[PDB]
Amino acid sequence: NMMEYLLQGSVLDHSLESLIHRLRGLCDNMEPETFLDHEMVFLLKGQQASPFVLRARRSMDRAGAPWHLRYLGQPEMGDKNRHALVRNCVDIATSENLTDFLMEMGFRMDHEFVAKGHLFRKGIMKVVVYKIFRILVPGLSLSYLVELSVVAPAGQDMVSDDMRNFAEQLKPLVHLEKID
Amino acid sequence: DAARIGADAAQKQIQSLNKMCSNLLEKISKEERESESGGLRPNKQTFNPGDTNALVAAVA
Helix, strand or coil, X not given: CEEECCCECEEECXXXXXXXXXXXXXXCCCCCEXXXXXXXXXXXXXXXXXXXXXXXXXXXXXXXXXXXXXXXXCCCCCCCCCCCCCCCEEECCCCCHHHHHHHHHCCEEEEEEEEEEEECCCCCCECEEEEEECCCCCCCCCEEEECCECEEECCCCXXXXXXXXXXXXXXXXXCCECCC | CCCCCCCCCCXXXXXXXHHHHHHHHHXXXXXXXXXXXXXXXXXXXCCCHHHHHHCCCCCC
16 A cells, blocks of 8 residues: 655765754754664565565664564556655564564564664655664674665655655765665 | 146056056966866865775785
């Protein structure tokens, strides 16, 4: 039923102020904040030959927040000049229940990654800046990521033009686009 | 009088000295213009999203 319009964003590692101040100023929110979490992709597909990803992104800096998981894949060919995303389906989880259910039903951890950066929001949009590290479980590619994403029901792709205009607003700093 | 003072230092020598000073000033100005003409363009610098885009994270 629901859908998504997640757009990919990649800025140089040194260009940080021109992004943080512009996003804090143009139109995001009042009183911004940050975050920290690590993702755990999984896959359980024996004969179907379609590994379904289950990102159990748990916020390590959160006070027992649920392991909000999302399923994304199979980008729909809409050709609406949008972020070229697919339908999304969020799913909350309990404390250590994601790993528990992954072990019960049977899953294979494809990889593990951690993220850390600042947070931003919008009206019907959402942009996030963070940095990915490559380290063991106890604790980088030198490239930040602007996570301009939209998650909403199908509707009529009205938010696509708004997201395109918002990206054109931040054109002097970055240049968002789709991905394969 | 047409010079108000002197005979050898009259309007002739005054005009000669003024022309010499004007030639020196014009040479200085031409040198300054030739030195300033070297400016090609205000080449600023910004982020490089062209590489990090393909280098962005993925399922890999």
